[PDB]
């Protein structure tokens, strides 16, 4: 039972669901154990929806951050006077800000949308309520919480005539997930603006993970990384971003993040992992797809890909974080020590030190 | 019992008072309902006193956002170095500093001073204390918790000297008697108060005016990252219901009556309702939409935590309609009607932001 | 049972021990008596070793503000690219961040070494622990967590090697040994104090307050970059045996003061309507802490120096109560120090002219 281990199977709380996708959400990092306090005001949002959907209107007391693990969708912002659609693709990340009305849709034919999202509530620490404008067989719209005279006489009309149109108290959808038609896809579709290279620093329109070039990356894996130094809407949420790919057999090398807590969470594949904490002690945890597993800062920690694997990391508190590797060539610490240091540090000569560090030719990603 | 509704008959406690005045606190926001965990750092004081008073000099460990609701007063916040007055007309508001010493007269000779503050205390979350340099029956000086021996040091005379011209009287902390000023410039003073009625409203028509500062504008604000507004409806007159995209409202009613109706989720819509009168207080949460409704002519501030980048949302209208902005093809798949019948619907209130019931 | 008194004969706790240094850590501020909520984050770390000894490379996930109280240390911080050393002296301080790796070496050969540290912790709120990289009889390497197969691997290395030449922490040294770890290490200067990296003295800057009596050095978020990121004041000030720290008051900084040497008696007072009175007998290696706008005097019962952390310290303003400069009660208007105090307008003037000499007196 490693605290900083969630369990899909057993962790994931599917919020609305039916025949054209679901939504599912993770449970409070801190309800977990103690020891993730400082993650309480932190959630997971899972989304996933069948081709040619869209996720009715509605807007949340929390702020969003999501990312585009696969497929393609249309993201439509809301405000009191204008509106902005963006084209979202694979490795496309944006925020929505609180309090703000939007909607999905899945414009694609044969592939589906999964959508994740790290959620920052506003009101109430780590809770937060989803108000969906539409009035759906699954839920009523957040209109008919006001009395039939306060609204008489703010839309200026009779009840009969705003429920034979907003309400409907058969002819409302089953849920808040519904099917499009082409010619509407077709119609919502252009004028969305779309993820470019001239976007990696726009305080507005999203921008690509892996547009660039990774920080780390040889023949076993690629290490893919975007910091708030180079992005305005990473500086205001301050949190860095991350896709890794890692070739089955490889694994990433021991390391450290200096005070950075990383959330991340399995994308593809599968993978054994292992987190020593204070005499040592270990948490290892083998992993799957969607599984989450919470990374606390300087604790080091290494991730052995056992098939081709590929995951998500979200890096809370992470302005001016640094990666401390342990072996390996380039980064490696425990190679920057005085001799005279590593000599009286562990039991061996200075020479017999500088002689098990300088064996293994490669940095960052190695071969198992 | 509406979690979201201080009622000010059983909801403030008493600080001082006597003939002059009185000062009240209204109870915690989170000791009242758990959904306010968010809203713990905060107190609202009320201030009150009565015609040629004084408020005896002192000082207390947490940040003061003042705004003086009516009447005139003369403000003074002393410094080890220096000391500056100013004056406070009604509309007027400014920020006294954790730990500044000061003062507070009631220069008018037939109207009573009505002041009202948002305290953020620096030491203990939500609970905060005054530090009386007076010495008066009703409370003693800080001085008088040194030893003797250590005061005849500090000041240079026996005890008896300054145990008879500094420690002991009044009964009271406000006492009977017998200067920069707000302008149309002063509203981005990083040290003067500024004046929320001395710019345009921002919505306004026939039944009623809206006005609202942000931090953005002021830099006393944005210190605190909270956003200003004083708005009037006319009795009958409606406030068009809303939402605020991220901001806690926390709305104090000055003088009249409303009853304001704060829609929240329990997917079932659970409807929160209450009639509130003068000095009571409803706080709401950030992005539920709620309605003001009211039953005569009425006057109310509204404390915006967290105002930062905030956004209004109105339903209803023909400005600043969130509806109405939605997609003509998602409108008829949201709501059990025709793309053409919404429209049409929308398109039905004239009026913006303030209709008339 | 003085809240604010933090005795060092009962709440310092040691972390390890060993005939060649000791490592001790305060108690939880807020553990003591909930009226120190806010300081729940914080925590006081102290560090004593003997001449010519090292603490083996280690790292914690904490922000540390190190200050040192006598003698002179070496300061190393290795980065995965870089390794910076730092020679400090008495009255240096410096900011080693979250999750960096680092050791210490007393050169001195006679003297010892005490530096006193405030920890910000990054993960659990006011506790953090230290992971020492070296492998030890008081302490297991961390790379020790791995298992032999991940070990085996990155290392490209056999294991019986890798345990071979791999797996106190306040070891000694030796004169070699000490020579060339000194060798080129950039020491505090008068061009050190608005910098990110290099450490800073105190008094290599004019006291703000000083007379015959005493002098208050103070440094601030405003003029030091570390200090900005942290918004923590420092200041270090002397008082001789019979003088006095003039009665005052903090506007919105929370101090936290630690007695370096030396002994005096404190006076803190709060409201109880009635004041109550907090009184407690300061010796070496105690801390008092004195929350905001609290007015609070410091009686030297011997020749004093101690520490202060100032928290919240951004726009803070010191207020005095009694002297001649920068006296509160000065600046109220004579026509209401009337109406404040039983004296009179007149009364009051004249004897708050008695005091001639601001900040320090004489007892
Ligand atoms: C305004 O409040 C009164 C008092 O309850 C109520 O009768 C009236 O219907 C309200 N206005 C509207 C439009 O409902
Ligand atoms: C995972 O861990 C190491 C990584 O190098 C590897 O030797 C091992 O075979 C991998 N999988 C299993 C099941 O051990
Ligand atoms: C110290 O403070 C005490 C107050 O208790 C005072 O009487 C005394 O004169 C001061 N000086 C010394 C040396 O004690």
């Keep these: 039972n ?15 669901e039916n025949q054209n996708g679901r939504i599912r959400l993770l449970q409070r990092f801190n309800k977990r154990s103690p020891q993730l306090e400082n993650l ?39 405000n009191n006077d204008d509106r902005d659609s963006y084209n979202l693709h694979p490795g496309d990340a944006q925020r929505i800000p609180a309090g703000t009305t939007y909607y999905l849709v899945n414009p694609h034919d044969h592939q589906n949308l999964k959508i994740i999202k790290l959620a920052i509530p506003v009101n109430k620490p780590g809770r937060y309520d989803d108000f969906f404008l539409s009035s759906t067989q699954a839920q009523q719209s957040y209109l008919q919480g006001f009395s ?12 009969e005539e705003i429920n034979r149109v907003l309400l409907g108290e058969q002819r409302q959808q089953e849920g808040v997930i519904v099917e499009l038609s082409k010619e509407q896809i077709r119609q919502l579709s252009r004028r969305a603006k779309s993820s470019s290279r001239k976007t990696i620093s726009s305080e507005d329109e999203p921008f690509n993970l892996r547009s660039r070039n990774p920080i780390y990356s040889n023949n076993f894996g690629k290490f893919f990384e975007i910091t708030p130094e180079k992005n305005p809407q990473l500086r205001d949420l301050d949190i860095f971003l991350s896709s890794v790919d890692i070739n089955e057999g490889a694994l990433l090398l021991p390391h450290f993040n200096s005070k950075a807590i990383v959330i991340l969470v399995i994308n593809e594949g599968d993978a054994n992992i292992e987190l020593v904490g204070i005499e040592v002690q270990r948490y290892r945890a083998e992993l799957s797809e969607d599984d989450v597993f919470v990374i606390p800062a ?52 200075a020479q017999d030190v500088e002689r098990l560090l300088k064996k293994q030719r490669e940095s960052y990603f190695v071969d198992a």
């Design 2 to 16: 490693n605290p900083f281990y969630l369990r899909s199977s057993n962790s994931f709380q599917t919020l609305f």
């Design 148 to 159: 039939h005279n306060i609204l008489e006489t703010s839309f200026h009309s009779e009840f």
């Design 40 to 78: 309480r005001d932190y959630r997971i949002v899972q989304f996933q929806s069948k081709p040619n959907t869209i996720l009715l209107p509605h807007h949340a007391d929390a702020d969003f951050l999501l990312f585009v693990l696969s497929g393609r969708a249309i993201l439509t912002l809301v």
């Design 298 to 349: 300087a604790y080091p920690f290494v991730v052995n890909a056992t098939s081709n694997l590929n995951f998500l990391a979200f890096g809370i508190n992470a302005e001016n974080n640094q990666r401390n590797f342990l072996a390996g060539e380039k980064d490696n610490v425990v190679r920057q020590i005085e001799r005279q240091v590593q000599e009286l540090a562990f039991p061996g000569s």
